Amino acid sequence: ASVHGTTYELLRRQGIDTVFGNPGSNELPFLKDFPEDFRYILALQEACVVGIADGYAQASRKPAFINLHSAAGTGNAMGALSNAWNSHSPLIVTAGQQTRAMIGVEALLTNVDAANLPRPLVKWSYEPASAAEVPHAMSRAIHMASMAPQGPVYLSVPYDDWDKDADPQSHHLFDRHVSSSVRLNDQDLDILVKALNSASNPAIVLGPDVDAANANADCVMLAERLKAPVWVAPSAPRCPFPTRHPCFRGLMPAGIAAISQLLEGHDVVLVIGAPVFRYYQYDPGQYLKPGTRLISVTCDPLEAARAPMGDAIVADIGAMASALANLVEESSRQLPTAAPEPAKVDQDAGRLHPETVFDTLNDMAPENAIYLNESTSTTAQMWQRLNMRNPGSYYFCAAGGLGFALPAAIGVQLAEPERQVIAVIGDGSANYSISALWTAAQYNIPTIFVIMNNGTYGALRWFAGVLEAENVPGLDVPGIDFRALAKGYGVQALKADNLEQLKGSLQEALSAKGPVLIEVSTVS
Amino acid sequence: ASVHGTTYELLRRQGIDTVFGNPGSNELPFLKDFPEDFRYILALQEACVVGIADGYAQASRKPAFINLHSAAGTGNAMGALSNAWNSHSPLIVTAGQQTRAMIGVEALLTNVDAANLPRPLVKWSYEPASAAEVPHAMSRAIHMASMAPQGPVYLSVPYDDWDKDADPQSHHLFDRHVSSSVRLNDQDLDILVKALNSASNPAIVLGPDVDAANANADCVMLAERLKAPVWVAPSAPRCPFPTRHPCFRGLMPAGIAAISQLLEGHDVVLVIGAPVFRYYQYDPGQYLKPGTRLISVTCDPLEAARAPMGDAIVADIGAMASALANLVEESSRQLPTAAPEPAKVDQDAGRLHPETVFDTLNDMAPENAIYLNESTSTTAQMWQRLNMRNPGSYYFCAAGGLGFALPAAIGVQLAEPERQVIAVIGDGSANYSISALWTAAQYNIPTIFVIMNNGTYGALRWFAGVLEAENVPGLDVPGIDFRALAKGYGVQALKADNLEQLKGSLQEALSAKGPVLIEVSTVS
Amino acid sequence: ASVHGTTYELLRRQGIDTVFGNPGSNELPFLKDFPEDFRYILALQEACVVGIADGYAQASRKPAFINLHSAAGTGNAMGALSNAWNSHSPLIVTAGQQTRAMIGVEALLTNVDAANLPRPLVKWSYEPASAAEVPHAMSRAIHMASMAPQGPVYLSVPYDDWDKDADPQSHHLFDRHVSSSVRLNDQDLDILVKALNSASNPAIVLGPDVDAANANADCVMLAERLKAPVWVAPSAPRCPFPTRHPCFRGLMPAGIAAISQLLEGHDVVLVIGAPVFRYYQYDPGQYLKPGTRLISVTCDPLEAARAPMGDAIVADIGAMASALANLVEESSRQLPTAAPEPAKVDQDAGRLHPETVFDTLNDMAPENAIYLNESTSTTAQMWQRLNMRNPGSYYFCAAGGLGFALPAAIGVQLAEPERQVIAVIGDGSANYSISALWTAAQYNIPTIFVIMNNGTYGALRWFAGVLEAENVPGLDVPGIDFRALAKGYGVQALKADNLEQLKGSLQEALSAKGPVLIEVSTVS
Ligand SMILES: Cc1ncc(C[n+]2csc(CCOP(=O)(O)OP(=O)(O)O)c2C)c(N)n1
Ligand SMILES: Cc1ncc(C[n+]2csc(CCOP(=O)(O)OP(=O)(O)O)c2C)c(N)n1
Ligand SMILES: Cc1ncc(C[n+]2csc(CCOP(=O)(O)OP(=O)(O)O)c2C)c(N)n1
Ligand SMILES: [Ca+2]
Ligand SMILES: [Ca+2]
Ligand SMILES: [Ca+2]
Ligand SMILES: [Mg+2]
Ligand SMILES: [Mg+2]
Ligand SMILES: [Mg+2]
Ligand SMILES: [Mg+2]
Ligand SMILES: [Mg+2]
Ligand SMILES: [Mg+2]
Ligand SMILES: [Mg+2]
């Protein structure tokens, strides 16, 4: 067998059947004789390729396979890799290298010092020393990406390798099963369980790795047993809890002082599947107030190491959540009372308040809808106004890198064909990966894109106005016609200048047979 | 003085007055109180920011200053940095880091292991150890980018540094003059000159560093004195010679065998300002045929080291070209005869042959026009059909990374307001950095964009059809309306489905007061 | 031909005939059939291997070739590479890698991520993608190390590569000549010369690159013409000037304030072949006092970039020194008056004052002796008491990394068989690379080692006593018998407990036919 044949067999035997890519000449020898059981999803720029694959992996809870062109293609994707790193997305990123005979002279398209290019945003990064090593290297990539803590990996392959003879002993790679589905030993788990049972006023904080593990339901059981309020860790990339469950308390403010104040009076705080903590704004104060002890369960040693406070346990979130939910006592305390519904913001017949948009989306969207957020100034309100009962219902750029939601929403919709995906994206954010729209059109992936148009980088005006920063350039983005951009890439386009039009536009979009973009005129 | 004040003073004292950027919160403390003598050029995505700055630097022959947002913004720009590396573009790339107090906990927007992110695509990459070091670090960045061989550099700055007190001793940085304007010592230069004088059938090969140094005219004198044919080194990022000069022989094929065959019978081949050589296609054979000796003058030690053949001299191209042109004897040999005009390709009343487009552009464009090329399957014909008499008249992605020409054409037009810029870009390539169009609209930079629409990644179909590669996915890009995309970003749009319409569309574009995009229907 | 045969031919054609090494199994396929025209110099530890090669390269003014074993051998040498980096030593460091077939599984002795190991202490670091690329890669290593600014480079080679067929086109590598022997263009050089001619009170500061270039004599002429005092830049790795020449003013203190005070009243300070400046102690103040302008000529862009003050010119030191010395006017000013001889320190019949040792060495050593210094607390006095008339007469660890002088003194003596090498090394420093002694014994390289034994890390007690640092552990090194260590490695050993014995011991050592170690009892 050839390296080509062996590698594709390894991929299919490991459950991979889709290649997200933007092709180049170094990659043609890999893509030729493309297996009929595989499917190729083209995107027009590499940030889009990786964004789509990322959404697909996060929603499918399995690795996604990517193929890019050498250094330039890899480089175009590096902003997208910074989100993937933060979201622990299992992405296998492959890139074509020049033929081995021309690497030395650094012919056009040589990826120089290739393995170093994507660092430090990958778990593993490699170029094999020979053609026959390629299948083995691919095996390593698959498993490195898939093991906890999951993350992106990078493999560079000289284009002449594919046609070379494979090592017959590579067959041992095909069916390898690698598990990191582990939890704390019985003795120490019993100690933890007793600490939770003994807490007088426990609180629970959940991060994105809960949703990634589909540990949501186990966490619901855990919170019900402990009669504990549940928060989502700050800068949340996913939603790990039903947002209308009686225990739910919403998204934590991303500040040190704010969080310690919030946790005051809680004697034991159990954090599951989150860094401790993904703060954003500088908000100096105490990490924890006297009387509060913190215990973190994380799948990532790097998270456990850098927590400024508390104990930590490094284990699989699915395994740990299930064990805890089934071991803890049912507290005799009263179940927390559900949070009241959000207030209705006054809305005239003109431009839309973001709050109005979210309320309307909540009213009209199916109960199993999936939302993506890249409307940076409206996150707090979004979290308060969308009832998300099911797992996998929310995604937000994990590293804060814009250009995620638009392509990721396409990958999510591909992963979940029966759940309507609705991406709420600011007019600023929409441009970063605008060309992703074409993929939705071409493959008829029926994502709905809601563009919140207020003509400015709103979150920046806020961050600025705060530090009283004056005379800051580059904050306004006037003069973009999103209906025209949608037409450019073959996506049906609608406009909503008021509530009447927003409702009508959503009705049409929800009925449509393909992707739809709605440009919403929002208040400045 | 503050670090902010000191740094801006250093920048202006070193000739920098423009910031190309896409802002983020880590950068607001740098951008606040933006100096009134500076101007900020916003682009909507970082590949575009860097592309624009790159075109500006290459055309202006001076460093360009860039400001990006942390890791995600830097990462979005890394494909653009791969071109900049290959073109020796003096780019000072700065990126905002989280406040020092929050770096440890890895708060949202922390650029982790920041200096390693852009490697290996930068000459120098650094984050200062303290606020007061920032001006010094900026000084280093300016000079590292500017010294031969020029290239991109990276500086990460924690956002809290800007408001801190500067070291008063930083004033010594302001007026530092650093020179690498050097040439071979007299003794060895005399030896080289004698070798050139003694050659019976010399040839000259010129690369992009000739145009960067504005050594074009000196090279013309050198070729006239030596009565030598002149080629452009393969995969040319710039044009280093008047394309209708009697000595000009055009663009060399990017193959080992092709080049040695081309140089056969030439006893001395002098290469100036090029790698030896930027081959592309695998084309095995002899590096040089018996009887041919090669001498390379390059500004880059890395180029000199990796040449598989010939002698090399590492020096400034401007200094070396001037010295050689003024020292060599006037050969009594006959001046080479100019190349004949290209053939006129048969053209019906339907879709345009690329050859027709280039002929028409040559007929109608001003004699001092500047062209950019990202129409990958038509490069050979473009080089044959455009009369480029002046320096700085051609740019092509130096690392072959698409997404360069569209934004770079905007930067070039900004650098050269009196020379009409015309970017010829394929329908595939146009998408990578499509959002750059907005910058042209917003700042009224009157670049003309000619989109060659054939609905496919044509160069890939060629590279494939060659290696008889069958069943390759992802090669077609149907369903893009470029007039709509232009409208989306506020750029006047025209369509040309035939020659009559192409002429009319060019007449209108050349008369227009702002940027114009022409979608040309080209043959499949 | 094989890769083995081709590589050795390349080495000999490029002037390499010696391999400094400590062998391992990955290297046996390279070392087998060792060419009879080559010679192998074994050392017992890798810090010693590299130290010896470093001294050899610095003294010979040509590249030295090193062969180490995989990661562990390379790693053992990394302290030595840190000195080599700072001294711009042209070292070609090769290391054996596992066979390509076993790299993937990471068999014992696999050098993982090999190219990254020696960073950031090398100019270039690489592992070839195939066997046939090895000769080309070696070519690159040779030239990267040899081009200005010179420095160490690293090449990792899988052991199975050597027996493979070489590319016949590799013959083009054999005779490549690469030059960086460049100087400032005529126009700007004339401007510099006029500035020097116009100076009312010029000063000259010289660094190690002067001695490396053998520009010493040209600098003498330059100083005589300008009638200028001459200093050696701080933390000097070499001696660039005759220390008894009337213009000589000695070693500059390694402090910011001290240097600006020293240069006060000098209107133009010309620095040649030094960083600006290699300060050590924190000594805050003005970089330069008002009235002083600085101009630096350096072979290293990294030096030019980081200078906190002055103008800079990046060029070859030999070419620049020669040009300046021959272009400047003869000033009518009076030649500086020679520095008075150092005072004679009172010396009783007991333990030796370091000053006594240096005075005695100066009295007894031949006029063409070469000294190495790793007696860290006595450097200032050494510089004042040794008359060094000739180039290549002094070496001191360029990065301050101990373990340099002992092995380097062996390499220097190998390079200069007719000049007596005398290494003055502290009792602390002597241990770092003690096993190097064996190489001197085995090859009968007649270096004299003078061990200054005061039983303590004297320089550290000083640096401590200064910052009033109390209760510092680990500063004393009692209980070492250096005569026994010398006997252990087969080197003749003598002891000097007083002046009478020091004179007798030196008389014997200077007459000896092989290496000699003298343990001198110095004052605590
Ligand atoms: C790749 C990248 N570039 C820049 C930024 C900085 N940034 C953060 S929020 C923001 C504004 C986004 O504006 P929009 O999408 O319109 O939403 P709004 O803030 O108006 O709600 C910017 C530019 C970023 N996070 N990522
Ligand atoms: C960032 C990047 N992605 C992918 C490629 C691979 N590539 C090279 S040419 C090409 C096709 C370009 O098509 P178009 O711009 O329409 O020009 P045509 O080839 O049709 O003339 C592609 C995808 C690249 N060079 N850079
Ligand atoms: C590899 C290395 N380790 C440690 C040091 C720190 N150091 C600098 S001077 C010194 C003392 C050297 O003592 P000795 O050689 O006896 O000379 P003395 O200071 O007594 O004159 C030490 C340990 C260093 N420079 N390099
Ligand atoms: Ca907005
Ligand atoms: Ca095309
Ligand atoms: Ca001592
Ligand atoms: Mg157990
Ligand atoms: Mg599915
Ligand atoms: Mg990197
Ligand atoms: Mg000269
Ligand atoms: Mg201009
Ligand atoms: Mg000159
Ligand atoms: Mg010698």
From Swiss-Prot, chains A, B, C:
Region span, Thiamine pyrophosphate binding: 376-459
Molecular function via GO: acetolactate synthase activity; benzoylformate decarboxylase activity; flavin adenine dinucleotide binding; magnesium ion binding; thiamine pyrophosphate binding
Broad EC category: lyase
Full protein name: Benzoylformate decarboxylase
Subunit structure, as described in the record: Homotetramer.
Cofactor annotation comment: Binds 1 Ca(2+) ion per subunit. Binds 1 thiamine pyrophosphate per subunit.
UniProt: Mg(2+) binding residues: N116, L117, R119
Entry-linked InterPro entries: DHS-like_NAD/FAD-binding_dom, THDP-binding, Thiamin_PyroP_enz_cen_dom, Thiamin_PyroP_enz_TPP-bd_dom, TPP-bd_CS, TPP_enz, TPP_enzyme_TPP-bd
Keywords assigned: Aromatic hydrocarbons catabolism, Calcium, Decarboxylase, Lyase, Magnesium, Mandelate pathway, Metal-binding, Thiamine pyrophosphate
UniProt EC number: 4.1.1.7
Residues where Ca(2+) binds: D427, N454, T456
Family stated for the protein in its record: Belongs to the TPP enzyme family.
Cofactor or coenzyme needed: Ca(2+); thiamine diphosphate; Mg(2+)
Pfam families: TPP_enzyme_C, TPP_enzyme_M, TPP_enzyme_N
Keyword Magnesium: yes
Catalytic activity: phenylglyoxylate + H(+) = benzaldehyde + CO2
Gene Ontology BP, a term: mandelate catabolic process
